[PDB]
């Protein structure tokens, strides 16, 4: 029984709710494709668009074995303008502790209450961010840890869904404004979520 995979599974489920919500509150897509729902006992917005939904799953399906190996240091939802320049980064900094501790108190009730706080902060972040320009799009950047091997082999999990190395323009953001959202430390997961925004 591999608890590093349990942790990968909680993170991928949560990262899916979180991408969907980010796309909502940053209005990356039209509002009508979203349905209000509850996850982590808290309101969220999930897209009902089939291929957007398939694209987010394929992305996260590819990330998940790196998560199970603790080989991922950040997962970044980056939002691009009509000119392919980053306007916002949503940085999920993730580290499993050196040894996972698994309580029988209620391991998953608790991590879910801690994840719920990340969702709530995402909801109210449009109260402090500048409205995005029209025609913005998104992508997902994965930063791996230094002792990680042939990531571009381990990460290509899905048949016709290649991964590449990003360019400097994909990620360039000279002197951004930093917006912390939430931080958690659990026996299984240390996670930071903050937003970098273009000056």
């Amino acid at each position: 029984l591999n608890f590093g995979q349990v942790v990968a599974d909680v993170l991928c489920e949560f990262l899916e709710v979180a991408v969907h919500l980010i796309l909502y509150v940053r209005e990356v897509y039209p509002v009508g494709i979203f349905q209000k729902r509850k996850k982590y006992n808290v309101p969220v917005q999930m897209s009902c668009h089939p291929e957007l939904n398939q694209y987010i799953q394929d992305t996260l399906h590819c990330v998940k074995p790196l998560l199970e190996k603790n080989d991922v240091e950040k997962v970044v939802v980056v939002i691009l303008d009509k000119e392919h320049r980053p306007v916002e980064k949503f940085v999920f900094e993730i580290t499993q502790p050196p040894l996972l501790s698994i309580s029988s108190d209620s391991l998953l009730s608790h991590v879910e209450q801690l994840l719920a706080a990340f969702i709530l902060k995402i909801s109210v972040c449009d109260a402090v961010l500048d409205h995005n320009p029209p025609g913005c799009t998104f992508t997902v950047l994965v930063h791996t840890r230094e002792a990680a091997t042939r990531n571009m082999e381990k990460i290509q999990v899905i048949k016709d869904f290649p991964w590449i190395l990003a360019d400097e323009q994909d990620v360039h953001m000279h002197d951004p404004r930093l917006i912390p959202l939430k931080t958690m430390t659990s026996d299984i997961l240390k996670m930071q979520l903050y937003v970098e925004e273009r000056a």
């Binding site: 668009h49 089939p50 694209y55 991964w163 190395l165 990003a166 400097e168």
Partner: peptide, 25 residues
């Protein structure tokens, strides 16, 4: 320098969004 998907996320026309709103709740 990080990795990203080579495939871009879909473009969604507002008619397609009206269809989603209308038929897939």
């Amino acid at each position: 320098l990080p990795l990203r998907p080579k495939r871009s996320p879909p473009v969604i026309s507002e008619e397609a969004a009206e269809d989603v709103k209308q038929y897939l709740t």
